[PDB]
Design a binder for this molecule. Structure first.
Ligand SMILES: [Zn+2]
Lengths: 146, 147, 98, 195, 186, 73, 73, 89, 81
DNA sequence: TCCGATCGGTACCGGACATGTAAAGAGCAGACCACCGACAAGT
DNA sequence: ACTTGTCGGTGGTCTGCTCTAACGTCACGGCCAACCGATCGGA
């Protein structure tokens, strides 16, 4: 799931020294605090508690500790697909974005009437890598936006 | 103020330091706006009553004078002139800079007026006024030639 | 030449002719002019009052140029009188009808 | 400076620009520009034209070029940058108080650094910060990156107040909200007269 | 440090002998002036050499209202103060004392010059303590603690916690956009 | 449809005013006035009615003494 | 063009919150003394819930549900 | 009708004079904060001498507090001997 | 020139008729008889003496903060007691 | 003579709204107020 | 007989300044991702 994926990504937490490390694992949800009708009547938030087991590891001594950590009240979706926030139902609208990958585009100049081809590499949370061909037939790479 | 038909001209021009300190009724010294407890404007701050004017009508900071009969006088303890509270949008202050600062309008413009006046390239002006390169203000040609 | 007009600048035809008439008599060599066609965007910003030009477009540049030139606004126009709340010099606002 | 100390005097920052403007000779520069424009030709002619325009603008009027370097920064009256308390106890600022506070803080820190006797590097850095703060106060965004407040929102300065469709001229001078006004849906009435 | 102390002592002796004293020899005056100038140069060199510790310390406080450069300048002031009070007789390295003074200066400046409405440090400490107690109670109980629990664990009246929470808010901006498009302002 | 005159009708004779600029607020819920935009000013100038434009600009929007004097008159 | 549903948006917000919490943990690790550190004294759960609440109350993609009729919802 | 009032003359250090109105039944302060932010006095034959403020702490005071005179004298003598040996061999 | 009995009567009436705590400065400015004090210390001593005399007569004066958001203390006489 | 940067602009009426973190603590001093003792002169 | 200006003391609260001694030494973060037209400064 999403929580398991993000906790697995965040599991390696080591400083520059690298003598200590903190790990997160096994997210868990508890029973809902209150029903939908009560939340709407009392102007509350339809949420459920979240518990994450955290382990602290010390490399120099090899001693480890395990404890249960409370993460907060995570809002929960009702059966109708709406989130109750402060007694008012809110709906999250999906978003359309361009998927990461490589894209090739062709442009035609109005000066020499010659076609120019460029390729843009669009990653997720990363720098941009581009290549292009000019009128002088010289391939150029533009790392980031330089 | 009144009789709009009596306005003949609306002249604009550069303001020198003398005009800037003639406009202001006082100098602000601290970056304070209001007290966190009593919600009252501080002294010598951005909202000082002694500098810009009273918040209440015909009342001073310490409350010594609270009557309309005290018109145009200045309280001898808090310094707040007892007048109307509508003067808080007509009085200005000024800040005494410890080092001169150039005006952004006349430097970072297309074309750069300072550059045209001093025959300096915009990059040279940017380096000079942002502490990146030294500029020779003057040179004693006669002394250099003699020795 | 001997006129006060800066070379390469754009001046009104009436003002240019008046200056030439002033220079030719008890003066020196008159200036020479050539007709110039200007767009609407450029002609509006070249008005004699900095207030209308500042209200129209490019407020920063117009204000800077007016401040440097120390230009004076005579307050005779529809937009300038609209801004300051005075009667416009058109329709019933002229001296003949008021 | 170490070897040929008593032969020149060079500075860095706005003080050097102020000294250059003080030593500037308007009449000689104007005469040289007129000679160049009436004698020379080529690409230099356009630059001579522009410089002559600027110098004549500074010469014909009664003002002086010393107004481009500031020694005192005026402060807008408090009512134009109100500090009001919204319902619920929350306060609101006009986004100018932050800029004024930054300028005042940097000026006071510069005063303290000069008083203590800090080395040249620290004093120069503080003066550069003061220059940047003043430039951001007068017009935010012209040089460098805009100053961002909470929520990564650039702050609104005086130039932003005077510019754009949301500026003073186009929002509160050429068009105002009036009293004695109404608004409602319209229907068609055939029994009415033309007036 | 020895050069700085020698220069300070030479300057003090020259000042004392200048008024109500006697005509110092020319060679002695030259020696005193040279010692004072050497002390000043040594102090400047010591200040310039340790300007990276300030940057290292001020890195951790970025993003708490104060700008990075302001934090650097306050750390530099703390470094100057540490240089003034540094003693070499104990033999401890200058890094520890410099770190202590830089941390103190940065913390004090960030406590003062970071809010539109200033809050005294003696109350910022109380706010921080209340926040720490609230976090501890939240972790221990598993739910948001009530004001009664905070008052019980902070040995204060149930009314002071509400006042402290009221003092902790920050003013919103009047120029923020209300609608989706930038046509209306608060 | 949900476009009813019970919610769209609006009128104002004298109501709240803003702080930085002494102008009436906007919106039915805030009892504000109707904006007299730039195009309406152009239309009034084209007609030739100077006095109506002057009154609309000054004594209904911004003239602080003018508003109370007009109401008293 | 891919579609980011509610799940991916909430996952991104939780990722931002966890990154801030990791930064706080790293900052606290270099200051506290060893042999006296427990997992609970290092974990600061405020940023995660703060980010979730900020997303639910401020993001443009979190809008009030239209309830004129079931079709609108 | 307006209440009578008096005018007090204050002079700053850099030759600036400002007028501050005061009531008849009031105590005119000796020193007043002028319009330019600089403290000014009242121009009168009998000067109301105000309170005097002693200078604050400085680097030398801290050095003297954290050290002793004898050790500083010994260090200065050592430095003088070193510079003398370096200069005249 | 106000007699002491009149001053005490004014003070007790002002305390009884005011539903909020009043600091010393407000009593000095408002209640008659306290405007003739040559110095602040003299006024404070006179007010302390008058308050002690009133408390000796059994009047239950109550002292507390002016407001929950302010630190200055005020005076109020409970009407029920 | 050509061209990589930089700045200027892009309709209107109606409506809507308000922040999310803090590495601390101790010692000494200054200003102000609620509680008080004396002591002679005016009332 | 009663009262008050003048003098001095305690304890509490709010506010500000100075100090702390193992060793510690040059930041991520990156939007931008439109479109057309005009102008000044390098190559
Ligand atoms: Zn007063």
């Amino acid at each position: 799931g999403g929580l398991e994926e993000v906790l697995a990504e965040l599991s390696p937490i080591e400083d520059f020294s690298g003598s200590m490390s903190l790990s997160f694992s096994d997210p868990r949800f508890d029973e809902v605090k209150a029903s939908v009708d009560e939340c709407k009547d009392k102007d509350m938030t339809y949420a459920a508690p979240l518990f994450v087991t955290a382990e602290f590891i010390n490399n120099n001594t090899g001693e480890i500790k395990s404890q249960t950590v409370f993460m907060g009240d995570f809002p929960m979706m009702t059966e109708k697909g709406t989130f109750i926030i402060n007694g008012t139902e809110r709906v999250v609208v999906s978003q359309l974005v361009r998927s990461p990958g490589v894209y090739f585009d062709e442009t035609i100049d109005k000066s020499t009437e010659k076609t120019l081809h460029s390729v843009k590499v669009i990653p997720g949370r990363g720098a941009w890598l581009e290549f292009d061909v000019d009128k002088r037939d010289t391939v150029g790479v533009r790392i980031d936006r330089k | 103020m009144l009789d709009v038909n009596f306005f003949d001209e609306l002249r604009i021009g550069l303001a020198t330091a003398d005009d800037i300190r003639n406009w202001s009724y006082g100098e602000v010294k601290k970056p304070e706006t209001i007290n966190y407890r009593t919600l009252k404007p501080e002294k010598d701050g951005l909202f000082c009553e002694k500098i810009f004017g009273p918040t209440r009508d015909w009342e001073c900071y310490c409350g010594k004078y609270k009557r309309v009969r005290f018109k145009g006088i200045i309280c001898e303890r808090c310094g707040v002139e007892v007048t109307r509270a509508k003067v808080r949008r007509e009085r200005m202050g000024h800040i005494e800079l410890a080092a001169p600062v150039t005006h952004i309008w006349y430097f970072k413009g297309v074309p750069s007026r300072l550059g045209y006046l001093l025959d300096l390239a915009p990059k040279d002006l940017e380096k000079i006024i942002y502490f990146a390169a030294y500029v020779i203000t003057s040179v004693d040609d006669e002394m250099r030639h003699n020795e | 030449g001997s006129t006060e007009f800066l070379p390469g600048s754009l001046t009104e035809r009436a003002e240019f002719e008046a200056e030439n008439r002033r220079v030719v008599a008890e003066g020196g060599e008159p200036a020479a002019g050539r007709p110039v066609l200007m767009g609407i965007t450029k002609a509006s910003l070249a008005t004699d009052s900095w207030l209308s030009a500042a209200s129209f477009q490019e407020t920063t540049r117009v204000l800077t140029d007016a401040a440097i030139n120390c230009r004076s606004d005579k307050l005779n126009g529809l937009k300038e009188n609209v801004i300051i709340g005075k009667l416009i010099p058109a329709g019933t606002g002229i001296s003949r009808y008021r | 400076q170490d070897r040929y100390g008593e032969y020149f005097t060079g500075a860095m920052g706005a003080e050097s620009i102020k000294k250059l403007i003080e030593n500037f000779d308007i009449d000689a520069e104007a005469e040289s520009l007129r000679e160049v424009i009436r004698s020379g030709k080529g690409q230099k002619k356009l630059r001579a034209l522009k410089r002559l325009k600027v110098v004549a603008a500074f010469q014909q009027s009664g003002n002086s070029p010393m107004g481009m370097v500031l020694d005192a920064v005026p402060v807008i009256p408090p009512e134009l940058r109100p500090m009001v308390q919204l319902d619920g106890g929350r306060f609101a600022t006009s986004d100018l108080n932050d800029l004024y506070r930054r300028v005042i803080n940097r000026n006071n820190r510069l005063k303290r650094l000069i008083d203590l006797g800090a080395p040249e590097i620290i004093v120069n850095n503080e003066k550069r910060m003061l220059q940047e703060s003043v430039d951001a106060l007068f017009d935010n965004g012209r040089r460098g990156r805009p100053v961002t407040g909470p929520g990564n929102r650039p702050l609104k300065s005086l130039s932003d107040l005077l510019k754009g469709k949301q500026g003073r001229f186009r929002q509160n001078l050429l068009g105002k909200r009036v009293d004695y006004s109404g608004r409602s849906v319209i229907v068609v009435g055939p029994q009415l007269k033309l007036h | 440090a020895k050069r700085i102390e020698a220069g300070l002592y030479a300057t003090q002796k020259l000042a004392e002998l200048a008024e109500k004293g006697e005509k110092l020899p020319v060679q002695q005056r030259r020696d005193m002036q040279w010692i004072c100038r050497d002390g000043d140069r040594a102090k400047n060199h010591l200040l310039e050499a340790n300007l990276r510790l300030v940057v290292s310390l001020a890195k951790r406080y970025t993003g708490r209202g104060m700008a990075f450069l302001d934090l650097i300048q306050e750390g530099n002031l703390g470094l100057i103060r540490a240089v003034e009070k540094f003693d070499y007789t104990k033999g401890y390295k200058f890094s520890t004392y410099a770190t202590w003074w830089i941390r103190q200066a940065i913390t004090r400046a960030m406590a003062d010059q970071a809010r539109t409405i200033r809050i005294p440090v003696h109350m910022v400490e109380v706010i921080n303590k209340l926040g720490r107690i609230q976090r501890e109670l939240l972790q221990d109980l598993g739910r948001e603690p009530t004001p009664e629990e905070l008052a019980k664990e902070m040995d204060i009246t149930p009314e002071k916690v509400l006042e402290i929470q009221q003092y902790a808010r920050e003013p919103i901006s009047l120029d923020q956009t209300i609608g989706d498009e930038g046509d209306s302002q608060l | 449809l949900h476009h009813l005159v019970d919610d769209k009708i609006h009128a104002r004779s004298t109501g709240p005013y803003s702080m930085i600029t002494q102008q009436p607020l906007g919106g039915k819920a805030q009892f504000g006035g109707q904006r007299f935009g730039e195009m309406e000013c152009w239309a009034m100038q084209a007609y030739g009615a100077a006095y109506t434009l002057q009154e609309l600009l000054t004594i209904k929007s911004d003239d602080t003494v003018g508003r109370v004097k007009v109401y008293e008159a | 063009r891919r579609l980011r549903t509610v799940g991916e948006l909430i996952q991104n917000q939780i990722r931002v919150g966890l990154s801030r919490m990791e930064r706080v943990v790293r900052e606290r690790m270099t200051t506290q003394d060893v042999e006296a550190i427990t997992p609970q004294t290092l974990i600061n759960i405020r940023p995660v819930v703060a980010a979730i609440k900020e997303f639910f109350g401020t993001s443009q993609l979190s809008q009030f549900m239209d309830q004129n009729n079931p079709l609108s919802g | 009708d307006l209440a009578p009032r008096q005018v007090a003359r204050y002079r700053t250090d850099n030759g600036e004079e400002f007028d501050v109105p005061f009531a008849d039944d009031a105590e005119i302060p000796g020193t007043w904060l002028c319009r330019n932010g600089l403290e000014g006095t009242l121009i009168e034959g009998d000067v109301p001498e105000p309170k005097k403020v002693k200078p604050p702490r400085t680097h030398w005071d801290m050095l003297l507090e954290r050290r002793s005179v004898e050790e500083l004298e010994e260090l200065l003598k050592e430095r003088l001997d070193l510079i003398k040996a370096k200069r005249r061999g | 020139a106000v007699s002491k009995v009149e001053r005490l009567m004014n003070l007790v009436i002002a305390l009884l008729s005011t539903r909020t705590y009043l600091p010393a400065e407000k009593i000095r400015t408002t209640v008659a008889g306290y405007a003739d004090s040559p110095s602040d210390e003299a006024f404070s001593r006179m007010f302390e003496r008058d308050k002690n005399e009133l408390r000796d007569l059994g009047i239950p004066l109550e002292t507390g903060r002016v407001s929950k958001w302010d630190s200055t203390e005020g005076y109020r006489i409970n009407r029920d007691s």
